[PDB]
Design a protein around this ligand. Structure first.
Ligand SMILES: CC(=O)N[C@H]1[C@H](O[C@@H]2[C@@H](O)[C@H](O)O[C@H](CO)[C@@H]2O)O[C@H](CO)[C@@H](O[C@@H]2O[C@H](CO[C@]3(C(=O)O)C[C@H](O)[C@@H](NC(C)=O)[C@H]([C@H](O)[C@H](O)CO)O3)[C@H](O)[C@H](O)[C@H]2O)[C@@H]1O
Ligand SMILES: CC(=O)N[C@H]1[C@H](O[C@@H]2[C@@H](O)[C@H](O)O[C@H](CO)[C@@H]2O)O[C@H](CO)[C@@H](O[C@@H]2O[C@H](CO[C@]3(C(=O)O)C[C@H](O)[C@@H](NC(C)=O)[C@H]([C@H](O)[C@H](O)CO)O3)[C@H](O)[C@H](O)[C@H]2O)[C@@H]1O
Ligand SMILES: *[C@@H]1O[C@H](CO)[C@@H](O[C@@H]2O[C@H](CO)[C@@H](O[C@@H]3O[C@H](CO)[C@@H](O)[C@H](O)[C@@H]3O)[C@H](O)[C@H]2NC(C)=O)[C@H](O)[C@H]1NC(C)=O
Ligand SMILES: *[C@@H]1O[C@H](CO)[C@@H](O[C@@H]2O[C@H](CO)[C@@H](O[C@@H]3O[C@H](CO)[C@@H](O)[C@H](O)[C@@H]3O)[C@H](O)[C@H]2NC(C)=O)[C@H](O)[C@H]1NC(C)=O
Ligand SMILES: *[C@@H]1O[C@H](CO)[C@@H](O[C@@H]2O[C@H](CO)[C@@H](O[C@@H]3O[C@H](CO)[C@@H](O)[C@H](O)[C@@H]3O)[C@H](O)[C@H]2NC(C)=O)[C@H](O)[C@H]1NC(C)=O
Ligand SMILES: *[C@@H]1O[C@H](CO)[C@@H](O[C@@H]2O[C@H](CO)[C@@H](O)[C@H](O)[C@H]2NC(C)=O)[C@H](O)[C@H]1NC(C)=O
Ligand SMILES: *[C@@H]1O[C@H](CO)[C@@H](O)[C@H](O)[C@H]1NC(C)=O
Ligand SMILES: *[C@@H]1O[C@H](CO)[C@@H](O)[C@H](O)[C@H]1NC(C)=O
Ligand SMILES: *[C@@H]1O[C@H](CO)[C@@H](O)[C@H](O)[C@H]1NC(C)=O
Ligand SMILES: *[C@@H]1O[C@H](CO)[C@@H](O)[C@H](O)[C@H]1NC(C)=O
Ligand SMILES: *[C@@H]1O[C@H](CO)[C@@H](O)[C@H](O)[C@H]1NC(C)=O
Lengths: 174, 322, 176, 323, 174, 324
């Protein structure tokens, strides 16, 4: 919700998309289908893997032998140990719970930013050669075949090729 | 119209729910729990070394040789000691062992351990060596005594003053144990040792101990009003220990060569031994590492996760599911 | 200012609106008024409530008896207790101060995105039928009444209904 | 050209409250919430329904042994924590010591049941003087007196027969028993009080085996006295018997305490008055009733308390930037 | 990054920009050069300075005397100190690593946020009078002197000044 | 024709500095700062302007009792902490022990005022010999000697009359007083030294009440000596008196220490040389500057120190992401 993509102008997820976390759905004269953007999916996978690994690998563990070796006339000493063990339990329980809550919020917004950035990359390429539908989709003013659709997903969309056709379409609705 | 390209994100049939700081029970596609909750329910070797498991005996009973405990076994090394919460076999003759908690802590992890005889029964030609026996320490239902120590009694109505010494010619540290018997009355004092006022002198390069019996009326424990206080020391190699007494002396017969390289604690558990290996042992079982946190048990031995009061620590990895 | 809305282009809150944390201000021939978006406001208030409750409820508190039970010949033990008590104070003080500093930054940026999300919602509907003034307002190129204001405030603005009407003024306004 | 206008905006109000972020300082916000507890009631309260044991100016030792300046019989059979002053005035009227005093106070910090009973009446010493064991250092209303719960036995008719007395704990509860030994100042004083130049004390239970001997030596005056009295204690579990043997310098017990302990606490050093209040967390300066994670009232807290921190305010932003 | 700018529509950043963290590069008939936006870099300078100072200054330090004052018959107590010392080492090592990891992620996102916000301020001023190349640059539909170049940078770009001349370059040029 | 162009961009420089984020490792940044302290000067320094007491060849027990084999140094009236070697060369020339040694060491770790004074001169013993309490295990100036702050009293003219002496602390400061008992080896040695087969020591103050007897027995040889001497200590508060009574085996005081204690410290075990420096945080391997929140030098620190962590770098990113 931080970027208004995952729950905002894109109102839902696609069950048909199975080969990635983020991707595209196209619909042209040759048919409709799903295509997953692996450049974004891999970078998201590495970052999420790094975060989980960092949360795990950065923990420092040492050999400790935790028992109860104080007698009935050393209860002051064992109360010192009780305050130490209970204090550390409070420190770790509070740290662990909040670390999960804060990072889970961060992880969800990380996916949100990735989806938003994908939308802006496609939008920045099409410019006025396509129409922003406000729902995560662009309606082309020209004919974008399967090879043209791959160019949009490859960051190689050629604006000058379809400029006059798009302008003619824009005037065609006038 | 037509020719549309859409941007979307993955979704699946997952019901996995994670909680965030601003929202609870958020269903996500994938998630991982970083909290360990599983143990094998077995006591394992700690980094390849089997624990010393005392079945029904305390460390005091096993050290002093209680006739109801086994006469030493193939335990030249152990990583931790497993005791029952209330071991039935203990000091059968009522008494105490000085610095018992500190002695157990040292013996928690031993690199090398070997019982040897330092003073044979032939070293007491003027005292009775077979008569040091009580009914509170029966071996086969017949009265006996601690196996690793000798309760010396007068011979020919005489208890000549003992002056004995042992030089630790071994290259390893020695653990020596001895005791003093506390009589019940003056008549019992002479019936056993013939000497009314008695003393025990124990001397090493560092130890300078004088003990005298405390003859008084005490409540019956295991049918006995008498008491026996046991003591221990670590005799360094090439050092010598000197014993001098004229009665009430519980003279050592066996001693243990000690090589200590690390430290552990005493584990109180009834869980059985599972012929396994682990880096972390809890009283209810062993746990495999790599999770930063766990909630199995606080009294752990080894490199363990951090013990917390949580039932779930679920990190979100996937996207918010629809 | 992480999303550039609160003090980036909106540049100022509205003391007039007392109904919610975010909302709209319409001004047409009928009159002028303040509207509050109950949807995003409720989400923000619920979201901040969870954050504050989580910071409070996750703290585990147990019975402890803190005193000074060691004598003049047990000061080494007392030093251990002192180092333990001082150590736990240092840990909690650092975490509590930094927890507030980090979460206060997130909460303010949480409010910043909600405004931009509301702003980007209206921007998509009007498209070319209204120009982008840059102060967080949309001056309609067409004429919009109170009923038409409601459509923008609940997400039902019909763009082609006022398309050419905008174009006639748009192609004439830019002529000077 | 009166172009119709729709705007996007956010809330503002008159609040002057300011929070700090990790990158900015002194940011005014519309709403804010503090998570640091800063208020206490300023009184000593009951801890979870149980009143504390407040010793006004007596220590645990003087209260237990029966210092005449203390309360002859306390009413509380149960308490949650003991309140002492920084320096109790009436500790041990006769100079001396109490063995394992710090561990004994820890045990008595929270006691479920506490009742004083008489285990050895003064009529149990037919051949010893039970009425001369007094001292100017232990006055009651000016006249010489002694600890109320123990008897200072003295020779009768220039004789001190060997004492052999014992007590079986026929009660169903553990018994706290206190006794002592008196250290004489010289050989003549030892004869003038016990008639036996060489004396001893033997105390035996199922676990205790104690041999005492007086330390007759020159010492410095405390409360006008060069003599000393060392006191000892043990827990006589039910159906176990304590056995006393002495031929001089014996401070015999008269009253004992039936004790049941089911929880642990500690001794609180405070002078704050009782407030007829209940709380789950108590500090020497006042109790706190809070659910906040942190507090800055006092470090020496008893109960379930927030984490004490070195902070004056931990205020979280629950609203937007104000303007 | 999390907003799209550093390694986003901008690729690498400018080595010739030594007068600040964020700024502009103009190219008109009068020449070309680099310039920095004072307000944005100053806020970034203060923000990171506050972040580093907060991490340093908020730490509470007290006098302690840490040694080994227990003998060979006080090993149980020395074990308690070892467990306490190692427990605090684990707490501080874990927090310091994660705090460094997380705040570094925040810092780079903070720089990413400033660049995108600086872009949007230019974007909302030029409007249809300029065309965005999609790589972090803008194409004017008119003539922009050095006086008008500063107007974009300093917030005083007057929209009607070139609206008519813009149409003679976008709509007129078919 | 030429469309004027205005561009947005950020800063970049020639920097190889790398930081790690929560999701990316080894990210090159234009600028960075390390919040971890990693350097120590390799010296022992004064702590807040007060030089420590450095016992180079001696233990605290040997230094207090005046071990003749320990080097004599100039009087130090105050110190901030005490430095001992891991294994001091000289601890107790005569084998024995000092009672409550660890607590005494901890109390003496930080002393505001320290001054040795004479309380019982050797002229105060008319009926006991004061110059023969001497052993070859404690040489001094080529002659057999003993601990030089105490005196080992011996029988004179085959007689050891019972000692009954008192000392009143007329000073305004507390007094540290040490004494001891000699444990013989056999009955013959006892009579040859004190003439009394059964001996005792009684020490009494307003708080102290101690009785000792020699433990005559056979022990092993330490420094070639089978005898032992156990020393004891107490703090004699002002205007209080200490009363010594003994008929043999008494190691009487000659010197005592006027002591004023205000703060607390510990004993540092180190062999690092003194550096004639000042610091706010001392480690057994060197002093650190303590400006950063963390350090990774050593855990056994004295002073106001950063939090000790097991890390090699804690580098915060301050600049932007740098690109090649
Ligand atoms: C050695 C023995 O059996 N003594 C018993 C004693 O016999 C005396 C006899 O040895 C001596 O020569 O002459 C005197 C008379 O001048 C006695 O006749 O008689 C006592 C009263 O009948 C017994 O007391 C009973 O002891 C019981 C425990 O027996 C044992 C034990 O099992 O612990 C028997 C052991 O043989 C004996 N140990 C040794 C090394 O001799 C011990 C030992 O006496 C005590 O443990 C020391 O305190 O006792 C019960 O305690 C019973 O209640 C009690 O009446 C003497 O056992
Ligand atoms: C018993 C008594 O009155 N002793 C005092 C002594 O009296 C002598 C008497 O005991 C002896 O039988 O006969 C000779 C003459 O042949 C004397 O008459 O006289 C001493 C000199 O004044 C006193 O010393 C003073 O004692 C003070 C202690 O007062 C008390 C106390 O502390 O309560 C008084 C008690 O009556 C007494 N109790 C008993 C059971 O004897 C105790 C006790 O003696 C001491 O506490 C034991 O150490 O003392 C002050 O100490 C004062 O400074 C001192 O001069 C004899 O008390
Ligand atoms: C944010 O606002 C607070 C007020 O809530 C400002 O705190 C004030 O800062 C000044 C200057 O630093 C302090 O004056 C100094 O006070 C100390 C004693 O505390 C004295 O030693 C100095 O000579 C000087 O007078 C002032 O006391 C302090 N007030 C409070 C209530 O804390 C703070 O400066 C503001 N911070 C920023 C970054 O604007
Ligand atoms: C923001 O940018 C605007 C451009 O739209 C700046 O206005 C221009 O400011 C410059 C700087 O002084 C003026 O140039 C000056 O002109 C006079 C007379 O020709 C000459 O004596 C000076 O040496 C200098 O060249 C320019 O006239 C002015 N434009 C106007 C008045 O239309 C504005 O100053 C900029 N803001 C800031 C804070 O720099
Ligand atoms: C704590 O910080 C201080 C101040 O930064 C460090 O002291 C500095 O140490 C360096 C290297 O030892 C000194 O540089 C040397 O200076 C002399 C001229 O005085 C020159 O001949 C040498 O070639 C070398 O450059 C520097 O002067 C000195 N600064 C001061 C003010 O004394 C200190 O090392 C830090 N502590 C630790 C433990 O790192
Ligand atoms: C980040 O860079 C460091 C070097 O600064 C990498 O550390 C190297 O890791 C390899 C792993 O095989 C070792 O062989 C090298 O010796 C390491 N070099 C140093 C200087 O420590 C580190 O691996 C890099 N991070 C990642 C994720 O690859
Ligand atoms: C992306 O797609 C276009 C259009 O099919 C193709 O020409 C181009 O080579 C592709 N890019 C690759 C394969 O890297
Ligand atoms: C979250 O889900 C769990 C599991 O069903 C449930 O017990 C809990 O009450 C839920 N919490 C909320 C706030 O709905
Ligand atoms: C033990 O024997 C060795 C053998 O040389 C001897 O040097 C040493 O002194 C002896 N230990 C004693 C006598 O305590
Ligand atoms: C106390 O009396 C009971 C009554 O049965 C008895 O069993 C117990 O042994 C006695 N305690 C002793 C003798 O210590
Ligand atoms: C020490 O001397 C002072 C001098 O007045 C005296 O009052 C005090 O009692 C003496 N201390 C003793 C005798 O313990």
């Amino acid at each position: 919700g931080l970027f208004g993509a995952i729950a905002g102008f894109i109102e839902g997820g696609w069950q048909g998309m199975v080969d990635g976390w983020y991707g595209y759905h196209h619909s042209n004269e040759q048919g409709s289908g799903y295509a997953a953007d692996k450049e974004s999916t891999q970078k998201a996978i590495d970052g999420v893997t790094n975060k989980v690994n960092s949360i795990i690998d950065k923990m420092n563990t040492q050999f400790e032998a935790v028992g109860r070796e104080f007698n009935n006339l050393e209860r002051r000493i064992e109360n010192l140990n009780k305050k130490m063990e209970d204090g550390f339990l409070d420190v770790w329980t509070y740290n662990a719970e909040l670390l999960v809550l804060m990072e889970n919020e961060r992880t969800l917004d990380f996916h949100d930013s990735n989806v938003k950035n994908l939308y802006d990359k496609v939008r920045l390429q099409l410019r006025d050669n396509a129409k922003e539908l406000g729902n995560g989709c662009f309606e082309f003013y020209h004919k974008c075949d399967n090879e043209c659709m791959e160019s949009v997903r490859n960051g190689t969309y050629d604006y000058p090729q379809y400029s006059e056709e798009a302008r003619l379409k824009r005037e065609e609705i006038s | 119209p037509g020719d549309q390209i859409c941007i979307g994100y993955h979704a699946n049939n997952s019901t996995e729910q994670v909680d965030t700081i601003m929202e609870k029970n958020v269903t996500v596609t994938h998630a991982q729990d970083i909290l360990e909750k599983t143990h094998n329910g077995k006591l394992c070797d700690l980094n390849g070394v089997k624990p010393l498991i005392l079945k029904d005996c305390s460390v005091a009973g096993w050290l002093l040789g209680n006739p109801m405990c086994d006469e030493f076994i193939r335990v030249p090394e152990w990583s931790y000691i497993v005791e029952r919460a209330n071991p039935a076999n203990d000091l059968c003759y009522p008494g105490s062992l000085n610095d018992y908690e500190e002695l157990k802590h040292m013996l928690s992890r031993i690199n090398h351990f070997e019982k040897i005889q330092i003073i044979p029964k032939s070293s007491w030609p003027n005292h009775e060596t077979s008569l040091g026996v009580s009914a509170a320490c029966p071996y086969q239902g017949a009265p006996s005594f601690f196996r690793n120590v000798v309760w010396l009694i007068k011979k020919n109505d005489a208890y000549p003053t003992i002056k004995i010494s042992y030089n630790n010619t071994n290259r390893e540290d020695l653990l020596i144990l001895w005791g003093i018997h506390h009589s019940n009355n003056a008549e019992e004092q002479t019936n056993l040792y013939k000497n009314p006022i008695t003393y025990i002198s124990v001397g090493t390069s560092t130890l300078n101990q004088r003990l005298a019996p405390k003859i008084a009326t005490r409540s019956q424990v295991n049918g006995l009003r008498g008491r026996m206080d046991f003591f221990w020391t670590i005799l360094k190699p090439d050092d010598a220990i000197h014993f001098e007494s004229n009665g009430n002396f519980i003279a050592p017969e066996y001693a243990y060569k000690i090589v200590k390289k690390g430290d552990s604690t005493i584990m109180k558990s009834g869980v059985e031994y599972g012929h396994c290996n682990t880096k972390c042992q809890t009283p209810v079982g062993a746990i495999n590492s790599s999770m930063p946190f766990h909630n199995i048990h606080p009294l752990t031995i080894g490199e363990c996760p951090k013990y917390v009061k949580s039932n779930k620590l679920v990190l979100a990895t996937g996207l918010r599911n629809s």
